[PDB]
Amino acid sequence: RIKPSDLGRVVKRKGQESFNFGEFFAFTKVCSHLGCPSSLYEQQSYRILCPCHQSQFDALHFAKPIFGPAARALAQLPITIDTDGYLVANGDFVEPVGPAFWERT
Amino acid sequence: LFGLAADRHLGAHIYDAANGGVLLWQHLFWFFGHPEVYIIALPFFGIVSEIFPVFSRKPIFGYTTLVYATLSIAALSVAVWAHHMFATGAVLLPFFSFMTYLIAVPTGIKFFNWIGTMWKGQLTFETPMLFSVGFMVTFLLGGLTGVLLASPPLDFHVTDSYFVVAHFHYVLFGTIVFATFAGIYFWFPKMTGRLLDERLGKLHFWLTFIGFHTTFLVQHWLGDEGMPRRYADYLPTDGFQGLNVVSTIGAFILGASMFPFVWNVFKSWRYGEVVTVDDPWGYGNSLEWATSCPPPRHNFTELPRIRSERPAFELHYPHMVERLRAEAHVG
Amino acid sequence: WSEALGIGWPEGITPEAHLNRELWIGAVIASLAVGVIVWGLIFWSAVFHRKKNTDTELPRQFGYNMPLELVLTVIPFLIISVLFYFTVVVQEKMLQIAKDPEVVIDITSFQWNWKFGYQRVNFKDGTLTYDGADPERKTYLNFDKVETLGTSTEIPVLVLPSGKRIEFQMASADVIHAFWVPEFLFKRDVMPNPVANNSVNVFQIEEIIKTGAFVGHCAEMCGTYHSMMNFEVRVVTPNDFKAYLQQRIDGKTNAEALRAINQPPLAVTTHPFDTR
Amino acid sequence: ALLMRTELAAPGLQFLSNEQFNQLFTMHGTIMLLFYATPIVFGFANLVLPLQIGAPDVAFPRLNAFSFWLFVFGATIGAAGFITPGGAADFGWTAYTPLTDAIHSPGAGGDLWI
Amino acid sequence: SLNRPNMVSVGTIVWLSSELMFFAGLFAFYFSARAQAGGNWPPPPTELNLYQAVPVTLVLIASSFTCQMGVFAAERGDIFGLRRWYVITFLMGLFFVLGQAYEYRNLMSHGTSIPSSAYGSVFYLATGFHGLHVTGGLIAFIFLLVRTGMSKFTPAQATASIVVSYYWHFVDIVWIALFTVIYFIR
Amino acid sequence: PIWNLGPYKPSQVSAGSQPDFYMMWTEGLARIWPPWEFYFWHHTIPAPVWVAVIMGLVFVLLPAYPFLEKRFTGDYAHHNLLQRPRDVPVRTAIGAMAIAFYMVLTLAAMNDIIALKFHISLNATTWIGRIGMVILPPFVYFI
Amino acid sequence: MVDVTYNGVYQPLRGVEMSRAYQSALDISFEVRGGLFVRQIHHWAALMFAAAIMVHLARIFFTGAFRRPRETNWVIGSLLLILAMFEGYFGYSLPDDLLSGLGLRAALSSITLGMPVIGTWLHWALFGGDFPGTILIPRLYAL
Amino acid sequence: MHIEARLFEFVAAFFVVTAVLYGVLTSMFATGGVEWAGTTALALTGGMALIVATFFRFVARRLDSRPEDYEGAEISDGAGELGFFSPHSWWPIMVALSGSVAAVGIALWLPWLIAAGVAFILASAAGLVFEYYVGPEKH
Amino acid sequence: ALLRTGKQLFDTSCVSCHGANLQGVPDHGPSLIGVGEAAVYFQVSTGRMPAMAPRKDPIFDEAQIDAIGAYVQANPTVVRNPDGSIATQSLRGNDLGRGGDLFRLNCASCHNFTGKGGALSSGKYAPDLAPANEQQILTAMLTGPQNMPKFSNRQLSFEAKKDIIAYVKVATEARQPGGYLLGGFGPAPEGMAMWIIGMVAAIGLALWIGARS
Numbered sequence A: 001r002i003k004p005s006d007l008g009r010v011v012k013r014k015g016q017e018s019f020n021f022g023e024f025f026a027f028t029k030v031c032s033h034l035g036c037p038s039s040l041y042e043q044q045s046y047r048i049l050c051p052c053h054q055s056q057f058d059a060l061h062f063a064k065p066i067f068g069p070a071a072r073a074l075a076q077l078p079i080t081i082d083t084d085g086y087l088v089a090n091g092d093f094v095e096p097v098g099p100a101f102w103e104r105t
Numbered sequence B: 001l002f003g004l005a006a007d008r009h010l011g012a013h014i015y016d017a018a019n020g021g022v023l024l025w026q027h028l029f030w031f032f033g034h035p036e037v038y039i040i041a042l043p044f045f046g047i048v049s050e051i052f053p054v055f056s057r058k059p060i061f062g063y064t065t066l067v068y069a070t071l072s073i074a075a076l077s078v079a080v081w082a083h084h085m086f087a088t089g090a091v092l093l094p095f096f097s098f099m100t101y102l103i104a105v106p107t108g109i110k111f112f113n114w115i116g117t118m119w120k121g122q123l124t125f126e127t128p129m130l131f132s133v134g135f136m137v138t139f140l141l142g143g144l145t146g147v148l149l150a151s152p153p154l155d156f157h158v159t160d161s162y163f164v165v166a167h168f169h170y171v172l173f174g175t176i177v178f179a180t181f182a183g184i185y186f187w188f189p190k191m192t193g194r195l196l197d198e199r200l201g202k203l204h205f206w207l208t209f210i211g212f213h214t215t216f217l218v219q220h221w222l223g224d225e226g227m228p229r230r231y232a233d234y235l236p237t238d239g240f241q242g243l244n245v246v247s248t249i250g251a252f253i254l255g256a257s258m259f260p261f262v263w264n265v266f267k268s269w270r271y272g273e274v275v276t277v278d279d280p281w282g283y284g285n286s287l288e289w290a291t292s293c294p295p296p297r298h299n300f301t302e303l304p305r306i307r308s309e310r311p312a313f314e315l316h317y318p319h320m321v322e323r324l325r326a327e328a329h330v331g
Numbered sequence C: 001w002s003e004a005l006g007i008g009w010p011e012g013i014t015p016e017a018h019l020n021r022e023l024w025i026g027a028v029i030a031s032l033a034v035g036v037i038v039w040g041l042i043f044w045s046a047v048f049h050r051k052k053n054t055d056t057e058l059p060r061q062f063g064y065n066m067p068l069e070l071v072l073t074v075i076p077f078l079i080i081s082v083l084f085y086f087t088v089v090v091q092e093k094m095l096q097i098a099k100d101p102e103v104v105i106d107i108t109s110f111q112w113n114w115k116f117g118y119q120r121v122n123f124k125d126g127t128l129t130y131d132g133a134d135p136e137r138k139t140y141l142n143f144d145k146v147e148t149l150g151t152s153t154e155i156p157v158l159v160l161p162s163g164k165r166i167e168f169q170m171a172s173a174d175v176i177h178a179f180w181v182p183e184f185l186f187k188r189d190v191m192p193n194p195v196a197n198n199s200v201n202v203f204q205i206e207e208i209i210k211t212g213a214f215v216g217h218c219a220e221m222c223g224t225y226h227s228m229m230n231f232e233v234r235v236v237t238p239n240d241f242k243a244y245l246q247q248r249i250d251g252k253t254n255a256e257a258l259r260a261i262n263q264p265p266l267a268v269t270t271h272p273f274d275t276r
Numbered sequence D: 001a002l003l004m005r006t007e008l009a010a011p012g013l014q015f016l017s018n019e020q021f022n023q024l025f026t027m028h029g030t031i032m033l034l035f036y037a038t039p040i041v042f043g044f045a046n047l048v049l050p051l052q053i054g055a056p057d058v059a060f061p062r063l064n065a066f067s068f069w070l071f072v073f074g075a076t077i078g079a080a081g082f083i084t085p086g087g088a089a090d091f092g093w094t095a096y097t098p099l100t101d102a103i104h105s106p107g108a109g110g111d112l113w114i
Numbered sequence E: 001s002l003n004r005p006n007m008v009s010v011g012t013i014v015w016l017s018s019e020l021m022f023f024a025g026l027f028a029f030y031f032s033a034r035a036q037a038g039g040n041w042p043p044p045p046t047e048l049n050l051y052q053a054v055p056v057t058l059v060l061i062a063s064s065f066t067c068q069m070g071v072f073a074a075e076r077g078d079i080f081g082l083r084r085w086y087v088i089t090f091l092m093g094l095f096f097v098l099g100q101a102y103e104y105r106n107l108m109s110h111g112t113s114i115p116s117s118a119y120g121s122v123f124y125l126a127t128g129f130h131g132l133h134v135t136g137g138l139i140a141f142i143f144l145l146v147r148t149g150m151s152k153f154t155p156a157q158a159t160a161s162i163v164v165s166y167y168w169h170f171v172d173i174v175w176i177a178l179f180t181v182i183y184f185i186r
Numbered sequence F: 001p002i003w004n005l006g007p008y009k010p011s012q013v014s015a016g017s018q019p020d021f022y023m024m025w026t027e028g029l030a031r032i033w034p035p036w037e038f039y040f041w042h043h044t045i046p047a048p049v050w051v052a053v054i055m056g057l058v059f060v061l062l063p064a065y066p067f068l069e070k071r072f073t074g075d076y077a078h079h080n081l082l083q084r085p086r087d088v089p090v091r092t093a094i095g096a097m098a099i100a101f102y103m104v105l106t107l108a109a110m111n112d113i114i115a116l117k118f119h120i121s122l123n124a125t126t127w128i129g130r131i132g133m134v135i136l137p138p139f140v141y142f143i
Numbered sequence G: 001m002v003d004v005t006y007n008g009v010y011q012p013l014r015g016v017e018m019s020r021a022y023q024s025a026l027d028i029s030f031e032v033r034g035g036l037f038v039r040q041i042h043h044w045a046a047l048m049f050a051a052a053i054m055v056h057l058a059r060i061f062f063t064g065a066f067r068r069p070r071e072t073n074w075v076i077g078s079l080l081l082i083l084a085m086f087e088g089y090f091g092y093s094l095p096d097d098l099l100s101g102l103g104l105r106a107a108l109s110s111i112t113l114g115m116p117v118i119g120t121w122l123h124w125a126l127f128g129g130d131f132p133g134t135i136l137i138p139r140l141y142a143l
Numbered sequence H: 001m002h003i004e005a006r007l008f009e010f011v012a013a014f015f016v017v018t019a020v021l022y023g024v025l026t027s028m029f030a031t032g033g034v035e036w037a038g039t040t041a042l043a044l045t046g047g048m049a050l051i052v053a054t055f056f057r058f059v060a061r062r063l064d065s066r067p068e069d070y071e072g073a074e075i076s077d078g079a080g081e082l083g084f085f086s087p088h089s090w091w092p093i094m095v096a097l098s099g100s101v102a103a104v105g106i107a108l109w110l111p112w113l114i115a116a117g118v119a120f121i122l123a124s125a126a127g128l129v130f131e132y133y134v135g136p137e138k139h
Numbered sequence I: 001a002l003l004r005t006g007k008q009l010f011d012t013s014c015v016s017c018h019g020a021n022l023q024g025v026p027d028h029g030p031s032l033i034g035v036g037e038a039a040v041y042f043q044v045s046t047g048r049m050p051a052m053a054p055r056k057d058p059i060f061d062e063a064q065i066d067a068i069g070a071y072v073q074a075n076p077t078v079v080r081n082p083d084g085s086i087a088t089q090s091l092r093g094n095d096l097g098r099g100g101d102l103f104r105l106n107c108a109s110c111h112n113f114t115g116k117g118g119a120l121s122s123g124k125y126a127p128d129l130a131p132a133n134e135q136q137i138l139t140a141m142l143t144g145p146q147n148m149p150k151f152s153n154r155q156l157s158f159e160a161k162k163d164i165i166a167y168v169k170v171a172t173e174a175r176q177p178g179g180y181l182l183g184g185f186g187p188a189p190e191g192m193a194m195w196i197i198g199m200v201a202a203i204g205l206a207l208w209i210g211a212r213s
């Protein structure tokens, strides 16, 4: 849940404009570098670290890799609200999740 | 420093504000530090003392007096440590003021000995004695600033200002840098067997001197009013804005002054004039000029007689022993 | 004319400042005279004796002039003794510490900003009598009801009368600080527990001749933002000072008190720094 | 010092921050005071002491090499405070009492300096 | 043709002077703030066990006596007497160090620690450097004994024995000075 | 101490990394490699393929060294007596080359511990390694 | 790889679903008298083996005994080094805690799937399908 | 050797005079009474000078005249063999490296690093001591 | 009563960074409005006090901390004992399994497996959990200091907090049954110990046993 204060530096990746719900983004976890899960989140710097190889991803810039051997941006997931006020998935991933291979991402 | 590290890592309350650690640590640190700047002075006074006679072609003036003055400075150097405490106002004023005014005199005695040494001599203008002249001029200015600083009411207003900065810059630089370069210019043939160029040395000296007295003269007029040291910014309302520009210009001038020296040294380490005989600067002293210019292991293969403080001079010129021993005590 | 000879020292506002400047001018004149003498001696030696022509064997091997050395080593003793005696006499007049100061102000210093106390008021003419002592304390710090406190964006201001006996007591919170006023021609450090460290935190001013606003800065290494905590002091007439006193007695801020007596609200010589 | 002089001119903070400025004069003063003057004095001593006194060699060459390498390694360790993200010791080379304790300046640079 | 004065002797004397001023700084640390506290300036939870401090002082005095006996043996042509005296001194110093360790354990067990009070901190700071110097002296003893046991005797070995001997004597002198400063004057 | 750890699950991860030190060079090479990728018709080759190529080349070079040296120097003589290390500068220089490369690769992946014990920037240490494995080798070779 | 409950001796890990192999490892580490000592000896000895083989190879390379009479010996030594390194890599992975699981996941899954040509075939052959397999641990144990 | 002892005892007398004068002037006319900080330093440096002068006198009062202390002596008087001097060696750089490691360890609080530094210091000292006493291998 | 004393104590030094009325200087620090006394208690007791910010000794000692916290509240409250003191034993949990699971799911990621120091990017790091007590860690996880993911009391049960408390206290303090502790890291310290001790003694014994020529 991003702080609602700024809400203006989000890049809103060219194909995923409406996949965010206000203060919600719901990013994936499997790093695209080798597949190590990433849990290192820094709220003030809006950065995500992969502890295996110390990657970085700007949560404000479509989870784009900025440093380290990371290659492509992490997958994103749309969400919405149900009738009872819960959280449900708005669809499915539009890119393959996991390390890239010979056929596709 | 052991106590400070113990406090930092364990919290031993040695320098706590509750106790008088504020005065304790300052007392001990200054008692250490003032002899520290007193250390870098005496050997370089020696450097200029034994660089004077070779170009003056005269015996040193006041030999035993010079030794007495050096001993007096050495003894009293650890009895004035508290004159850094005037702003604190918790120490004895007149005692340390009197001690500082007493320790001032032997430096003047050294100045008088040097001026007598160079008085009425066959002076030849080369790079080492140019460096010596700049050294005495800068050290005289710094000593005047220091003897001005010794007044407690004066430092009750001028402390921590750029005036003290100019004081210590003047004295420390004017001794160490100038005498280091002069001693390098002198001893380089002894160590390497090669002689440095004189035109490049003269240009280096002139550029260094110009840059130094250009960048470090307005500091009196800047620190006289309100501008204490260690400030990263100030306001545009007050004046003294162009003085900082002049200081920066002079500092930039001094910055490029080092390049001619290093270029000349690098060129002459492998190339340049080669000294094949002992003592290229004739009329040497202090016994180093009795061996080959490239010194082999253990530095000696022969030893001459030891009869005075100028053994190599008498060895090379035995026919002025009588003149040396005749008119020595005339004055 | 003498201002150039004074090496840019700002004009005195207190008799001891004038005495200090007189001593400084005399010492500067003497030092300049000595330096000129030695410079001329060096130049004369390096110009005429330099004439090493093509005909010379050896100038002279002489190095013993003991009576002359004694004369030249005794001569500076007289001048250093004279200046030491003058210094002792002058500095004695600097520490009068009168038993009955007219106005006592408690200076509170802490990390990166100042604070003013206004301890008490007592006038010899019997016009002003007030004590601002606060038993709020239940530790070495001093607390008062009427107190001037500063902020990173508001320049602290001190209001002081003219021609009065003024006293200040040092009291710091964490680190060393040096209360300095360029126009006072005086400086002094501030220590956490000067009584526990056996140092004098008390100094007094006889009176101030001129009036107006003056700048001040601290004069030690007290952290990072050491140079962004200047302060201003305002000197006013006794009646205006009294009026400001009773105005601040009622609940009012610094700007309101200064504005209500026909005075600029903020400091004129200083302005806040934007990037902090 | 040249970087210092560049920054201080043109009043106002052009490109240098305050804490880095403090680090700057701390390191400059420390280096020029306790890593140039004393080693150069001892260097001239080593050059011209046996030659002035005429002795063939020094008493303890092992101690001489020990002192030289100790000084060099200590200088390298102390000057290596610029790699710390928090910087080296920030107080001036005077190093007064209350700012040098554990309360203020808790960075690792002070230990390296000491 | 060898110079009658020995350069090792004067060098070790100068080094001895250096650590003398080091312990001088230690004493300056200790005496400071002692007068700051009034009345019973030692804290009430502190009490020195005199029944253990004097015995280790006598232990060190006996160690020093064995040291001068060993150096007197060294001045003449025999090494086994030196070895015996030095071994006795080493054992006595080991007992001394163990006694100090026991005193430290007892003091820390039911009271003062380094961050507890100023008096405990200064006392521990003063005693720790002395203990470290004693351990260094023991290491020097071991090194000297091993050096003597692996080569023929030379005057250099006697010089090393002498310098170690009066270094230990200086250690004894500074220890008794510290004990008189702390436990008697209080 | 496995008991201090926990059972493996896909959703748990932490700074626990840097496996045993005798295969550690592969992890270091993976960490240091710049992110170069190629994209052609519905295909993508990721960065780690270069790591596989480098480790395969290291595999190949190890047994091929004697033949390479024999063909380079053109020596075909029998020897039963060894050579002291200070008599063959070229081979010792190549050995220093290899050992320095291995050491700089090993210490590069100690980035977390190095930045933790010693307060150093993680990015700074990564860049130090990134310049080190290329500029350090020639210096030690010449030295 | 069948999920089970601990309900053993180590109280902080009671009632947590976990792999059976990790349960056996904890059993031999805590329940059997002295098992921890023996397994620690095993691991430390393996580390000693790796260090000793590296030092021996370095000494052989320095001495230059790899000339014509003994080149096949050098080739055999290289192959021994490679196989020992791989087998040691397989060593710390049998007690599949989260650290070893992460290491093997990263290395094998990433490099094997990253092959430009074969890729998925090799990974699916090794793991029998997706990365988390029921046959991976027994196969690794047997190997 | 007499001049050096005379200078050392002169320094001792000066230090003693300064220490006693400072103590006297700090006893009275002082806010804090006895300074207790610089007085100890002055007294103990005076004691340093006293003890070193005493040692010099003791080694000089039982000493014979040397050619260097005798004016007019000839270089042939001092002819002979001087003391032993260490030739080229490399132990001190290793000892300095170990000392630097120990200093780094005591800089940032890592007890394992300080223990390693202490062990390396002991090893380097052992290497330095035995550099000129180990004989041939026993085989 | 206590409010005035707390306000005076804060205004003695707090205005220099944050503000007289807790306003917030734009380029110095935050505004200090939403956060309660829990934030002040954690930031004061631990020792990350005004710096030039690693661990440091506290300035205030358990007396005025409550006063300044109450003063901040008037402009998330700590858990206190029924007798008026701060809770110290009631915060200990009973179910260790859930505490360990939550530690490995949300705690261990940044700090360590055993709670020691952790490595982050660009300066700041993860400190060791040893020098912190139960009240400190509870108010810290409830507060969300810099570079911290702050946790709401709604998303985490109070039983979950006590289980975390018990697990962190048991894990760090209990003596390791494996002998000497090598820092709690991975195999890198093990390999370093190997290089420094293992084959060093081996080569020493080889030199002793063997001859050299």
Ligand code: HEA
Binding pocket: B037, B038, B040, B041, B083, B084, B085, B100, B104, B105, B107, B108, B109, B111, B139, B140, B142, B143, B144, B146, B147, B149, B150, B155, B158, B159, B160, B164, B167, B168, B171, B172, C034, C076, D094
């Ligand atoms: C090499 C370095 C060096 C040298 C040689 C000196 C030499 C002198 N210094 Fe300086 N000083 C410093 C470096 C040095 N100083 C430093 C680094 C600081 C403070 C650092 C810090 O706190 O930041 C300092 C601070 C300092 C202070 C206190 C400043 C302050 O804290 O407010 C004072 C005042 O007492 C002082 C005085 C003197 C005097 C009287 C001499 C004398 O040795 C020189 C004066 C003597 C003469 C050469 C005058 C000419 C002599 C004759 C011709 C005889 C004529 C007769 C008379 C007129 C006397 N120095």
Ligand code: HEA
Binding pocket: B165, B172, B173, B215, B229, B230, B231, B250, B251, B252, B254, B255, B256, B258, D001, D002, D004, D005, D008, D025, D026, D028, D029, D032, D033, D036, D092, D093, D094
């Ligand atoms: C040995 C002592 C020493 C030396 C040699 C110097 C050298 C110089 N100093 Fe410094 N200075 C001090 C000691 C010294 N200083 C001390 C102690 C303080 C303050 C102490 C305190 O307050 O804490 C100070 C502070 C100080 C200040 C103000 C800072 C302060 O006091 O608050 C200034 C001016 O702004 C200054 C100027 C200079 C200049 C222009 C030189 C010139 O002489 C230097 C010329 C040299 C060169 C510029 C080298 C050339 C550089 C290059 C060309 C780099 C080449 C590139 C590579 C090869 C990569 N000094």
Ligand code: HEC
Binding pocket: C111, I010, I013, I014, I015, I016, I017, I018, I028, I029, I030, I032, I035, I039, I040, I043, I044, I049, I050, I051, I146
């Ligand atoms: C500018 C120097 C400075 C000083 C002086 C200072 N602080 Fe802070 N402190 C900070 C900064 C900046 C933060 C914001 C968090 C951070 O930077 O890590 C902070 C953190 C805090 C926090 C917690 C932050 C939050 O979001 O809840 C509180 C509460 C606080 N300070 C109050 C105080 C108190 C009490 C003092 C004691 C007088 C004080 N400040 C003095 C710099 C300072």
Ligand code: HEC
Binding pocket: A039, A040, A041, A042, A043, I046, I102, I103, I106, I107, I109, I110, I111, I124, I125, I126, I127, I128, I129, I130, I131, I132, I136, I137, I138, I140, I141, I145, I146, I147, I148, I149, I164
């Ligand atoms: C950035 C992601 C991040 C996650 C996820 C995280 N922390 Fe931290 N933690 C930090 C940082 C950064 C520090 C260093 C101190 C600081 O920055 O305030 C820290 C340090 C702490 C400290 C102080 C250390 C000490 O011993 O004094 C406590 C307590 C703490 N964390 C609690 C938790 C709890 C409880 C969880 C999860 C249930 C958690 N942390 C998970 C970032 C994190």
Ligand code: FES
Binding pocket: A031, A032, A033, A034, A035, A036, A037, A050, A051, A052, A053, A054, A055, A068, A069, A070
């Ligand atoms: S798997 Fe994320 S950086 Fe390697």
